[PDB]
Swiss-Prot record:
Disulfide bonds join C15-C93, C155-C162. One of its GO terms (cellular component) is extracellular region. The 2 disulfide bonds play a critical role in holding the catalytic residues in juxta-position; reduction of the disulfide bridges results in the complete inactivation of the enzyme. The record marks S26, Q105 as: Transition state stabilizer. This is Cutinase 1. May have promising applications in chemical and textile industries as it is capable of hydrolyzing a variety of substrates including soluble esters and insoluble triglycerides. Can hydrolyze and thus modulate the surface properties of synthetic fibers such as the plastic poly(ethylene terephthalate) (PET), or the textile fibers polyamide 6,6, polyester and acrylic. Keywords: Disulfide bond, Glycoprotein, Hydrolase, Secreted, Serine esterase, Signal, Virulence. It is an enzyme of class 3 (hydrolase).
Amino acid sequence: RTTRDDLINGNSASCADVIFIYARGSTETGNLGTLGPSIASNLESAFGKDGVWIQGVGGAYRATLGDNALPRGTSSAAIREMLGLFQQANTKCPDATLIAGGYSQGAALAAASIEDLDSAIRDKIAGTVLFGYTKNLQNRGRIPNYPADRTKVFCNTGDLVCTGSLIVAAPHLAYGPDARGPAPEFLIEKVRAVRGC
């Protein structure tokens, strides 16, 4: 994959039932990077191609390494880009269940976006998965204003970004197994616990 713009390309007269908005790590390509396509394949297996729109955060999100040092772990420009895609999902397809994920800086962008979101759209996100969450210790493993039962965080032992640092060490690069099994399983499970459209 690396690039998927199914919400931007998707026809309103035929909205999918589940819309996944995913944000990539620093320096990754497309708008999905290394982890996103693996979750995507698996979501498409559970709901079928026409059942799920996978949308990466592109536009203004540049995934510049330097932006991890910014207050919220990413630029304000990038919080505006993911905020605008949640608002597009909401308007284009209001009966769709949303799900979200992010890796590394995409995990801090996902947590910043969901914190600022309007409560009525935020409440439609039935499960969020975060890999190598750079604000893991600062936020104590939670996304602000978003329930713990709907959040799953994958933080490897020795991934120093989970422990309040910004050093990239080898565990930070070893999320491939999770993106292939636990993380789509959690998301599929949360969407089924509430149901789809």
